Design a protein around this ligand. Structure first.
Ligand code: CYC
Ligand code: CYC
Ligand code: CYC
Ligand code: CYC
Ligand code: CYC
Ligand code: CYC
Ligand code: CYC
Ligand code: CYC
Ligand code: CYC
Ligand code: CYC
Lengths: 49, 161, 49, 57, 162, 160, 160, 162, 162, 162, 162, 162
């Protein structure tokens, strides 16, 4: 509530895959909720390295 | 807490035999009187505020207890007295439906006298208020149910007194 | 703007009480089944309905 | 120094309560020694009166 | 929660108009099965442990892997939890039958059920099979007419799981 | 009884008895004559019900009368008839009360430990009370049997 | 009062009074003489405030003195005037104490329950207190009138 | 994804077991329901635009705040997004109904939808209401027998969102 | 929450600096307006119930569907809840005006409010209209400068809800 | 728990009468002593640690058996309890000083302390001696005028525990 | 939670002296008896249920009036309390035996027990008879060497009850 | 990204209301300050490289360890990345000042910046110090009023990072 938006996919942290060589591993809402929604707007530009 | 049914079951359990004819007669005397008890309970439920208001008025309003120096003199203290009268009415209705005074003795009179002594509540004025509530309830519910409810109000009065 | 969001559920406000809802929730609050009194009351309710 | 048997009456000054709260006002509990200082302080801050305390064990 | 009565009352309150023919038909249908549903509820409330016994026996006979080592029901604790969940399902199905509405199921079973079973590793298909076995046992116990009324909510739970 | 449960529920919420609880009490008192008549109907045939229940119990579980069982021996039968008598009495008390509580306090709270001490198997209890259920439901009328069966198989389920 | 609230706040977290609490106590005691002068003026002319407020309230709400109203009758009107006298005395007490704690503790906590028991219309309270506030602020100077009217404002909000 | 046939096959493959009578019973059940499923799928494909049409109109009539200014569906962009989401819901419910399994719904729709909607500010109660709108709109078009089948998948979507 | 003084203190503390000329100028500017803020707060506490009455009347006049069947204010329960929400907004806007900062608004009102109403079904736009109505009602009672200052915080509330 | 002002308010309220001129004189007395009271309170808040230092030192000097084995202070826990008691006594004495009334002492110090010490076996005489030790040194720091004025509260504590 | 080892430390600390040869000898005595204390405790815990069986059987054979209606033990609940009291007596006797001090008995069993039993109508002499029946079976099982040690605790409880 | 004009447009579109006098007043104020904003932006653009040079010189003089071995700006690569970040901050502060709204900072600069720097290892405090040095340098070039304007955006960035 008191900090800027996180470095996150605009549709939630579960939409970000692990940056591994292969596999497409995502967090699941159901196996362990661990879900953080962020009010990321349409003009938010992510900071990439 | 127990009702007449629980009381007779407890007695015949301690004595260890089945329910005989006399137990049946007491149970029927409770059951056939049930409709009157529910009529009285519904009448009190609908008009509880009016009963407590009339009783508090006639018993307390222009007596010295409301004036400064009395136990009832505050908005909080007056509201607390009306709240206690609500307690008495509701629990007398509960006891009347249960047809037993052990509920009145336990839920209401357990440590109440010590609390009233420590707080400074006058017991005699409480007895007067409970009595006035008794006649108000009798007037609203009719003589038949009023006689039954008078037993529980008198139990409350002797508990405080 | 809001920096963060907690999420939105679907609230169930209680508008009023029904006899059937009252009996069922009385059973459920104690995490139990229906006693003969509740069964008789529900039967009488369906009779007077 | 094991236990205290405490009887106290905490009245209500902030509002009027519709529920019973009779046993909440006038009560006797057994309080552990390590907890009696904090419990006595709480009763005192609440405005209640500690009627008497005895030593149990 | 809601029942059939609350649903109709709200449906006609949001419109702001009295009960029409369809409303009275819904209420008459709900009231007609009321005594049958209350009889079935009394039977289930009286004989819940029995129904759990045959339901669990059928489930663990059809799928013995559950109670053998390496199965999700292999321990005393996990077996007790399994039969406890089955009791939950039976009781809430009884609640839904008496209410006539599946709102209580959505509110107090399905809300968080999938998260729980996917976190704990509980096999959802086997739970559906156990619910079906419970349906069969309770239908055999309470009669076909009440069996259908039990089965509609048992199917609601099964479809919620799978 | 039903009245005590309703009063406790109303006191929990600090409110007068609801009309649902009120007409619960109304049905409870309106059904009093039938319930008392049922309680008596159980009472005259006490010896008949108890002996037939014991016979059916031996037939269903020979292990109790078999050698090495907890009920094996003639001396155990005197206690068996008397204990079935207690449980029938509790069933009648619950019938007049309108709920399962008197049975609960008198014979259910602590029955598990009571038969753990005496090394009595719970299945023997459930089969015996099922036998009483069958005998009584045979004696009573269908409408009364429907009401009394709840108490009987509640005792059965509580025993296990 | 002010020092009472500061002491309660300090003792709540088990410490000596904060410098800010000491400053607020100094501000309270430094203005104590002006508070006592306001107490002079309000206490001396109490009859003017009470009677003028009663007249303004009755004119604004004639239904109160009309038959069937709560204030109808000589005794009920006397009780009206006595209630206004009580609230004026409490307002003076709060003026002296520097906080509205006397008003609240004496006649605000549970005021709604009591006036529900008396059928007293709370808008009657509000209009009577507003008339009292008008008279009191008129008889005082602006610097005093604002501070005094704050207490009447709190009382009216509590009743409303 | 997974359908009923593949579900049975995978269960027996993980057990290393052979198709027994129960497996063939389940296969027979699916083959029996297949023609109804195919007819319903074709009907829903025919009327998909109509179903979205009516469900959107009804949802925005029951809750007109969505389309008025300040609503989540108030703009051409956000209205078109609502219609696009409803078209997904219809198409994927049809897929699940034709398959006889809700695994496709889980993996393609429900895995990540709550967090997407919570991050977007999308109301989830209103989305469930829109799903129920599609449910009882398509129920009329497919017929009672096919409605009973598609309803479980619509309720699965609703329970996944709720 | 934080006020203007605390805001300046935080800004200078995160930079590890003492108060410069600009800091003292800003603090003096806040101190100059303190008496006006106290008078405005007293005036609002004077007429809070009044302001709620006119604001609700204006809102329900311009939004009559709110109190008709199907509207979210159509109940005495829902009406009381709406006017209590209005009380919340007025009280916290007065707190913000007295503090001189919009932090208390964001912390205790705006955070989580849109999702709360989305769960409850409350229309955000109608609430914004009610807040605006409260703004015109309050401005006349408080006067010109107090109205500018007090409407800044009403605009903050409306924008946060918007 | 009441100060001088609330005490006079209570004694005039119970009689039902308004303030008289004697009440106003009593009030002027406390308002005139207020600045001295606050100054003494600040001094005591600054020097509380030192007062505890020297008070414990003098108490354990005059009575050596208390710290030695067999004494009612011989333990690290029991030593800490004694110093905590003295600190609380000092703080509440300063509280009563600021309030101007001993009611706080009855309501927050002597409330249950007498019988607590009686049951525990704490010697009354040693406690009174410790109170005297704190008072006669605190009076030296606070000045003679504030010394005489803490005298009443300290010997009130001594007489109450006596 | 008093022990002989704890008791000697408490005594030397209250009288403020170091270890003596008497403490050396008594600590050797406790340590040497410790192994037989271990075996006695293990044997009793092995047969605690059997001991309670035999004691209850003997008590109910001696005085059947308790189990029959009108007796203090005529209820499944009251029978549960009956056997629970014996189990507690056995367990705390074993605790005292392991401790080597009877202070644990005074602290957690005996104090207030007579008044509680009188208030609840529990017969004291019957409980003493039960304790005697318990001690005879315990002494038979453990053997004379441990029987002598267990005898003093059972006698102490019997004397305290009387 | 939204400027003052866009913010007014959105706060009036959410209400659904057309423009009235207040909106025109806010727009007029923005056009009143527009000339100052354009001159400040042109001056900053004309001297961006210079501003970065003195700001980085001041930061590395105040914190010499940054550019020494073991500092996060010790490499031609990391030094270049550092001055690149400083150019980011200056350019986006100029954007925000020219728009009159801090939205672009939250929208394109401060989002995920803390996580990015923490993953890189960049000292947050030293970046804030660089921003403050850049503020001081920019103020002298832009003059008093334009410095007061740019200061709110520089302080916004510093508070967002810290
Ligand atoms: C180069 C760094 C890297 C690794 C190592 C890696 C592991 C990896 N192993 C996978 C599958 C797998 N990996 C294994 C191997 C394990 N299971 C068996 O029991 C063995 C005990 C054990 C190997 C000794 C198996 C059986 C699967 C199939 C699981 C599945 O597809 O669901 C997958 C899923 C994607 C795919 O199969 O295409 C990944 C991502 N990913 C990476 O980016
Ligand atoms: C359900 C059973 C029950 C009872 C009976 C009961 C009595 C009761 N009355 C109380 C206060 C009070 N009760 C009264 C009423 C008294 N003063 C009037 O003059 C009368 C003579 C008399 C009543 C007829 C008053 C004035 C107080 C406030 C006393 C104080 O706080 O100083 C309190 C203290 C808690 C509180 O103030 O809320 C209790 C516990 N509470 C219960 O839960
Ligand atoms: C009414 C609302 C409700 C539901 C639905 C519910 C389900 C539920 N079941 C649980 C445990 C469990 N549930 C099961 C279910 C069984 N596993 C077998 O394989 C079967 C397939 C299946 C039943 C037929 C198992 C094995 C556990 C224990 C898992 C573990 O703890 O490791 C738990 C974890 C908490 C606990 O252990 O007490 C929950 C929350 N709880 C609720 O309050
Ligand atoms: C109303 C509550 C209540 C109950 C229920 C009760 C039962 C009870 N049955 C007992 C004996 C017994 N009762 C039984 C009978 C049963 N045990 C066997 O496992 C069979 C399964 C079954 C007979 C077929 C037996 C075997 C004994 C032990 C010795 C004896 O026969 O007396 C005893 C111990 C002393 C006595 O004989 O009175 C009790 C307390 N007592 C009560 O106060
Ligand atoms: C200091 C704290 C305190 C207050 C405030 C208080 C108010 C109070 N006013 C009362 C009567 C009354 N009070 C009023 C006045 C109201 N009715 C009219 O409608 C007007 C709108 C309004 C006056 C402005 C009236 C008419 C009565 C008579 C009602 C009756 O006796 O039945 C009573 C009933 C007992 C009695 O009159 O002796 C109380 C307790 N009591 C307290 O201890
Ligand atoms: C601010 C951006 C925006 C716009 C523009 C917008 C348009 C819009 N037009 C609608 C219906 C409509 N729109 C029209 C207008 C058409 N009729 C004729 O064919 C003409 C060619 C044409 C007008 C010139 C009509 C007749 C309807 C009613 C259709 C229906 O009720 O099914 C609706 C549905 C209203 C509801 O569900 O309550 C919306 C939201 N929505 C927005 O958020
Ligand atoms: C059954 C449940 C229920 C009822 C009846 C109810 C009545 C109700 N009528 C209202 C409006 C209104 N109602 C009335 C008067 C009417 N009111 C009636 O009691 C009279 C027969 C009649 C005049 C003689 C008026 C004049 C308004 C306009 C708003 C106002 O009074 O300021 C309002 C305020 C909301 C609005 O502005 O529309 C309510 C809550 N609320 C409920 O939840
Ligand atoms: C705020 C009012 C207040 C106070 C001060 C207070 C003190 C207090 N002191 C206690 C014990 C004690 N109190 C003391 C202090 C006394 N013994 C000697 O040293 C001195 C003569 C004397 C100090 C002047 C000691 C040493 C103990 C521990 C002795 C023991 O373990 O029995 C206890 C028992 C609970 C515990 O220590 O955890 C309390 C509650 N309680 C209160 O409600
Ligand atoms: C810390 C160790 C401990 C002790 C010593 C203890 C004694 C004890 N016995 C109790 C009741 C009881 N105790 C007994 C057992 C006695 N009556 C029978 O006739 C026998 C002769 C005899 C057993 C040898 C019975 C029958 C009751 C039930 C009384 C009642 O229902 O009120 C109770 C009250 C619990 C209740 O009534 O539910 C206590 C506290 N409890 C403890 O936790
Ligand atoms: C390991 C990679 C690396 C390099 C190469 C590096 C160079 C470097 N040289 C610097 C200063 C400097 N460097 C020079 C060197 C120039 N003077 C003449 O013109 C020559 C053409 C030329 C050298 C042959 C000078 C004069 C300064 C002082 C600049 C000033 O303080 O104004 C600085 C500024 C910070 C400081 O003074 O410590 C850096 C970062 N830093 C690095 O981390």
């Amino acid at each position: 509530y008191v900090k800027p938006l996180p470095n996150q996919h605009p549709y939630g942290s579960g939409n970000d895959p692990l940056e591994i060589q292969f596999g497409a591993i995502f967090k699941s809402e159901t196996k362990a909720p661990s879900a953080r929604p962020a009010p990321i707007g349409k003009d938010v530009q992510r900071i990439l390295i | 807490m127990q009702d007449v049914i629980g009381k007779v079951i407890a007695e015949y359990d301690t004595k260890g035999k089945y329910l005989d004819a006399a137990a049946l007669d007491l149970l029927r005397s409770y059951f056939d009187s049930g409709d009157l008890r529910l009529k009285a309970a519904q009448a009190i439920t609908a008009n509880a505020e009016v009963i407590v208001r009339a009783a508090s008025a006639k018993a307390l309003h222009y007596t010295p207890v409301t004036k400064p120096g009395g136990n009832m003199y505050y908005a909080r203290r007056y509201a607390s007295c009306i709240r206690d009268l609500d307690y008495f009415l509701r629990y007398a209705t509960y006891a009347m439906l249960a047809d037993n005074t052990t509920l009145l003795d336990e839920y209401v009179l357990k440590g109440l006298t010590e609390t009233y002594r420590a707080l400074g509540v006058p017991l005699d004025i409480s007895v007067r208020a409970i009595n006035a509530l008794k006649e108000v309830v009798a007037g609203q519910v009719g003589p038949k149910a009023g006689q039954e409810m008078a037993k529980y109000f008198d139990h409350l009065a002797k508990g405080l007194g | 703007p809001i920096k963060g969001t907690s999420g939105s559920n679907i609230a169930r406000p209680r508008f009023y009480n029904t006899v059937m809802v009252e009996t069922i929730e009385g059973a459920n609050a104690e995490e139990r089944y229906f006693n003969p009194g509740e069964l008789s009351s529900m039967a009488g309710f369906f009779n007077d309905a | 120094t094991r236990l205290f048997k405490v009887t106290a009456l905490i009245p209500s000054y902030k509002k009027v309560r519709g529920g019973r709260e009779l046993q909440n006002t006038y009560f006797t509990k057994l309080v552990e020694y390590d907890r009696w200082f904090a419990e006595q302080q709480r009763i005192q801050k609440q405005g209640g009166k500690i009627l008497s305390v005895k030593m149990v064990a | 929660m809601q029942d059939a009565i609350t649903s109709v009352i709200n449906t006609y309150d949001v419109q702001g108009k009295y009960f029409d023919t369809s409303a009275f038909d819904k209420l008459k249908a709900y009231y007609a099965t009321g005594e049958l549903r209350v009889r079935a509820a009394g039977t289930i409330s009286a004989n819940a442990a029995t129904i759990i016994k045959e339901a669990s026996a059928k489930l663990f006979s059809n799928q013995p892997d559950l109670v053998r080592p390496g199965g999700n029901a292999y321990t005393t604790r996990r077996y007790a939890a399994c039969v406890r969940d089955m009791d939950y399902f039976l009781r809430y199905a009884t609640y839904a039958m008496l209410a006539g509405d599946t709102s209580i199921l959505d509110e107090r079973v399905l809300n968080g059920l999938k998260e729980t079973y996917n976190s704990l590793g509980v096999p959802i298909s086997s739970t559906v099979q156990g619910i079906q076995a419970m349906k069969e046992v309770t239908g055999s116990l309470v009669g076909s007419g009440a069996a259908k009324e039990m089965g509609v909510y048992f199917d609601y739970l099964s479809s919620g799981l799978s | 009884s039903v009245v005590t449960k309703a009063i406790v529920s109303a006191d929990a919420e600090a409110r007068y008895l609801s009309p649902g609880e009120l007409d619960r009490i109304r049905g409870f008192v309106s059904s009093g004559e039938r319930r008392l008549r049922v309680a008596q109907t159980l009472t005259e045939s006490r010896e008949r019900i108890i002996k037939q229940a014991g016979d059916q119990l031996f037939q269903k579980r020979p292990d109790l009368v078999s050698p090495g069982g907890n009920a094996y021996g003639a001396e155990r039968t005197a206690s068996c008839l008397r204990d079935l008598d207690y449980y029938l009495r509790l069933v009648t008390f619950g019938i007049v009360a309108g709920d399962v509580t008197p049975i609960e306090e008198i014979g259910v709270i602590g029955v598990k430990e009571m038969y753990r001490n005496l090394e009595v198997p719970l299945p023997g209890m459930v089969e015996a009370v099922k036998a009483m259920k069958s005998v009584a439901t045979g004696l009573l009328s269908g409408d009364d049997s429907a009401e009394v069966g709840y108490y009987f198989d509640y005792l059965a389920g509580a025993l296990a």
